[PDB]
Design a protein around this ligand. Sequence first.
Ligand code: HEM
Ligand code: HEM
Lengths: 441, 443
Amino acid sequence: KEMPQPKTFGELKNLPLLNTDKPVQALMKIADELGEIFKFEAPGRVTRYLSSQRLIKEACDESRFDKNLSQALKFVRDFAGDGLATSWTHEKNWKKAHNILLPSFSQQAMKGYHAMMVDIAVQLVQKWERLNADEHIEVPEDMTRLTLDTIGLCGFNYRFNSFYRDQPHPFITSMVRALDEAMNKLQRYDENKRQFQEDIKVMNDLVDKIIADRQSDDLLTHMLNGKDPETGEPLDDENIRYQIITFLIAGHETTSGLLSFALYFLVKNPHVLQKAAEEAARVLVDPVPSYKQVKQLKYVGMVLNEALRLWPTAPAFSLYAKEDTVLGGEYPLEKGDELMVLIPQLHRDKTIWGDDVEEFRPERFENPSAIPQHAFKPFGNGQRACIGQQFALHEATLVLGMMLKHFDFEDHTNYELDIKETLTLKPEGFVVKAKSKKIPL
Amino acid sequence: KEMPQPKTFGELKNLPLLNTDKPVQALMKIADELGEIFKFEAPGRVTRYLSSQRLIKEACDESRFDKNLSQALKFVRDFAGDGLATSWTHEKNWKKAHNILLPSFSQQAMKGYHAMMVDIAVQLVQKWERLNADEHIEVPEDMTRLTLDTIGLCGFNYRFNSFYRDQPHPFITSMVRALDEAMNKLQRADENKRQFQEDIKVMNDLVDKIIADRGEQSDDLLTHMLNGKDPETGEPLDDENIRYQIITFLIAGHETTSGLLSFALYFLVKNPHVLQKAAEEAARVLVDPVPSYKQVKQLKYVGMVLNEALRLWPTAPAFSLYAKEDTVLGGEYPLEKGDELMVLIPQLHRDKTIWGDDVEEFRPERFENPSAIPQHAFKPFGNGQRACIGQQFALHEATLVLGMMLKHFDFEDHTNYELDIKETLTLKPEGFVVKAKSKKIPL
Ligand code: HEM
Ligand code: HEM
């Protein structure tokens, strides 16, 4: 009944607890101390961080809870607008864009994106096989190059050409700076605000240009010509730009974190890497992986799911109670009461996964049916779950599969996991050396 | 390319090779001679026995191979029906029961079964401490008493009370004779069939009775079967499949597990250093009169002992696969769609390229770090979504029971028992007997 709350800071309540560069990990440590639920108060806001499958499975009841816009999401809404990720479920443009865009993210739609995913994946592999001796790989940097280019290419046939740059594409640099500003205001300026609007313009001008410029096999085509079966309406141009902005953000950084964490856990667990590398070798018998071969990379997918278990790169989502309801039979919630699902802690729930929750064990996902309901939520929940899950997973499986096929990897620095936090998670400074297996493409 | 084939018998092809009392061990010797793969032909059937991890890791690719119903399983299907073990993956009742029953077999659901496992384990321990001096233990017999009662109690809140009997429960004798007829039917070209139907009825009537008897809510498999709804179809199991699952879980829940404990204890008394190390772990971990669930999980070496026992003698010694599509096995054995494979698990577990030269030695330390074992090298519980749903059940039960056995008794191989592996559809060390000197630790 009496809900635990972490230390307060006078009138600031718990807000300064987020005044840290690693708020998710700070929240997880708080979850370690306080348990499955703790109240988090900030000036003018109360939320509850859920960390157990017991409570989160109720929070995932869409008849009782709907997606809430966290303060993080509300600030991403400043440039993602009513894009899919920053729109409320009851906003007409969410279900509209949902129905319009869901066929473009089906498992069957991955077949159309596969070639362009390979295009970028080949560029990644070519970059690494072209490295000189003793040179190392900046993993999250290269994973972001790949995921950004993959969503750019697969999403609206735009080549960010990140592998031709060291300084990222002006869109990416503005987007990150905006996202950073979006995060800074959570734990918080006319220079910041003008820069924010300028970064908004840099993002929007690119996007808005390409909409006017444009049949490719991409998300933009479906956005330009797709009609919502419900309303019969297509997305208007302002929402299409918001979706592109949404897909550029939501399409790259969580996926690059996944690949970065996956490779980190692989090089930290050589036996797991060996299983994954040997599967990659046995399955990817062609110079270019086919869609079906990527689907055949069962273990690589398990590696990715386990990476998503330990470090879900979109580490939280927010919910609000649609009506008065009792959470877990002991925590009464009033209509509109907010919940935060602390996904990394949920994925460390000892009652679901056993005691070895901190161990990287892909075999937890041999049989996905075995995972209890709502125990594994790296892609969110219900109709507001990640529309790009199959995209992210297909890309990450394809890329990780090719990486393991073509290179032996060395944790040459004995890298100490340092998880940099934006709105997503990434192992900062994670570097490896890759010894090419000299398998041509 | 050209697949080896063992000796043939004219029109019977290789079938008379299975007309033997130890067909698995016969197949292992054949695998010893012919290697990682051999074609096995019988009238109206061709299959291929795989024995190397190299080929079995491909056979375990669920995108290429799905569980096949071996002729044994096809005959067990006569009374296990479309229960989980004898149903095809594409049968609606498989995925239904799969999704419905997986929560009842989670490692977290083992916590709910633990007390009833202890209930039976304590009965086993008290039976042995109540033996008089110089009296011996019939090991597989008592392991079957325990595993049958544990699945009976944990599965459907039914007490077979096997420790109150010398002649096993009428269900078991009917079940064994059914399995006997099912196994004997492999070599079949009216009294046998009438007896077979009667044994089915003995099983069905009891099972159906408890289903009809069961509105008490127990913490068992039967509750999940009666109230569980498949999240996919939204459907519960109907009563005809629930009866098949109980029959399935009664068969699949005890004898393979009892064989494990029987083989485990066999290898322990045959390896006193392994026994002492496991016994010392039991003493260090089982500090309470009744083992807790967490203490069982801490019996790491006991768990390694069981895995090594499952390595040498996987008590469900084979499973069958069929090629979902045309595919090439090992880059040299082209398979047509529907082509059958048998995974000869004991031979797989003797793959020198995986385990080293000492594959016949009982060395639980092989399992110190399970991560080190390559994929599909150790398959005592089958493969993929068709793997043993009760693996964690069997292992928790066996670890708990073996842990308590090692805590409470010093064991003597007083006959210097010569391993004689009885073959039904499972493996057990027939006639394996020990003496237990009680350590006089109360419960
Ligand atoms: C490993 C990679 C990814 C992870 C971990 C991830 C995670 C998530 C999570 C947790 C949510 C729910 C957020 C919330 O409820 O507030 C979400 C939603 C979303 N994601 Fe992802 N995502 C990934 C990749 C992608 C990709 C590749 C795309 C696009 C191509 C994408 C687009 C979206 C969109 C549009 C939504 C909002 C869906 C809606 O509400 O209708 N994501 N994602
Ligand atoms: C050491 C003990 C055990 C061993 C070695 C073992 C082994 C196996 C193997 C190899 C399979 C796959 C057979 C095939 O693919 O044709 C299997 C399946 C199965 N086992 Fe076990 N098992 C054991 C204990 C148990 C227990 C304790 C239960 C129930 C509580 C159980 C219930 C089942 C079921 C229902 C299946 C079929 C699963 C499915 O196809 O969905 N087994 N077992």
